[PDB]
Amino acid sequence: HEFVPLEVYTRHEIKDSGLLDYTEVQRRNQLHDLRFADIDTVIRA
Amino acid sequence: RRCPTRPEGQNYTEGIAVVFKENIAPYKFKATMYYKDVTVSQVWFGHRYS
């Protein structure tokens, strides 16, 4: 007999069960300046 | 002596099955966020610097 690997929930399923992920929220939020803003440009009148 | 007899054996019902587990994955959909970054900057201009 061969026993195949079986599991009710994977690690990914358990980690995805969470409603909010701090790492992903931070990663998306901290790209705001790089996406919607021009960090490099300096304006001097 | 009266020799023992073998049991008839369990009667198996062949069939097709689907096994469901409790759902833990959140329901996901696509949303769109509309907003406005309002930035008011107060600058004091010194003799040489700002």
Side-chain angles (χ1 to χ4, degrees):
Chain A
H1 195 78
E2 300 306 286
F3 292 82
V4 300
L6 196 76
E7 50 189 358
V8 192
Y9 306 104
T10 71
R11 283 190 321 279
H12 323 115
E13 290 190 66
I14 287 178
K15 79 173 54 153
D16 200 5
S17 82
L19 193 62
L20 265 190
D21 206 17
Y22 183 62
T23 303
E24 288 319 295
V25 173
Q26 277 314 296
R27 198 256 169 180
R28 185 210 175 79
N29 274 355
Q30 293 189 45
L31 277 166
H32 183 92
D33 273 358
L34 273 163
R35 287 170 71 202
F36 303 106
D38 188 359
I39 298 313
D40 295 327
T41 303
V42 184
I43 296 169
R44 177 51 289 173
Chain B
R1 320 207 169 104
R2 213 211 80 241
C3 287
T5 70
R6 274 222 321 281
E8 302 180 353
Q10 262 304 310
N11 285 299
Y12 285 138
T13 302
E14 172 84 51
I16 311 178
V18 188
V19 188
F20 305 84
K21 70 198 164 177
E22 177 202 336
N23 184 24
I24 66 172
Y27 165 72
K28 294 158 276 201
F29 56 100
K30 312 300 292 178
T32 314
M33 272 186 57
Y34 308 116
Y35 59 96
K36 297 197 184 169
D37 283 16
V38 169
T39 301
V40 176
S41 71
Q42 171 190 351
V43 178
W44 189 76
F45 302 98
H47 186 273
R48 175 80 51 232
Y49 65 94
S50 304

